[PDB]
């Protein structure tokens, strides 16, 4: 099972400046619950966005996708194609925009957090992938975060 997990503003922005322009503590617990114990695949930029102290994420098989021949990610496996990173019973692609887009054709599930924040799309932003008609998703109820923002969860799936 290959899944994609991300948090977006309603506008689809997921990253900017090598960072995420909000904080949603509930989503961090939700992200950790979904990915805990499994393989996580991420782009090399996303891997660089994590501080060295949190790298690699605990309890998960961290894999970093890069075109650099002998790129070294201390604590993670480095592969040159996504397919090499996808060989586990359960794999979660955790970003970024480039790797979500590359990974979607191999994905059966998407766990999407939508953050009710008026964040306009900006040139150079990392964006969430657009899900077509083949994706059947369940919309969650609006939830209020300890951070003061409103959000809701989407669980998409295709057969
Ligand atoms: N849930 C979220 O909101 C969320 C989750 C994660 C990340 N983000 C944000 O996403 C942003 C970064 O996403 P990004 O799209 O800018 O960069 P990225 O997708 O995280 O990783 C980009 C890198 O992936 C590697 N790559 C891309 N296609 C490849 C391929 N076909 N084969 C091998 N390697 C490949 C390249 O690494 P080389 O340059 O080494 O070739 C490329 O530089 C950051 O702002 C981060 O905070 C948000
Ligand atoms: N600290 C931290 C920052 C960003 C991520 C993300 F999944 F978005 F890549 C995970 C963690 N654990
Ligand atoms: Co699990
Ligand atoms: Co299924």
From Swiss-Prot:
NADP(+) binds at residues 6-7, 14-19, 43-46, 65-68, 80, 94-99. It is an enzyme of class 1 (oxidoreductase). It catalyses: (6S)-5,6,7,8-tetrahydrofolate + NADP(+) = 7,8-dihydrofolate + NADPH + H(+). Pfam families: DHFR_1. Its EC number is 1.5.1.3. Keywords: NADP, One-carbon metabolism, Oxidoreductase. GO terms for molecular function: dihydrofolate reductase activity; NADP binding; NADP+ binding. Inhibited by isoniazid metabolites. The prodrug isoniazid is metabolized to isoniazid-NADP adducts that inhibit the enzyme at subnanomolar concentration. The keyword Disulfide bond does not apply. InterPro entries: DHFR (IPR012259), DHFR-like_dom_sf (IPR024072), DHFR_CS (IPR017925), DHFR_dom (IPR001796). The keyword NADP applies. It comes from the Bacteria. Key enzyme in folate metabolism. Catalyzes an essential reaction for de novo glycine and purine synthesis, and for DNA precursor synthesis. This is Dihydrofolate reductase. It comes from Mycobacterium tuberculosis (strain ATCC 25618 / H37Rv).
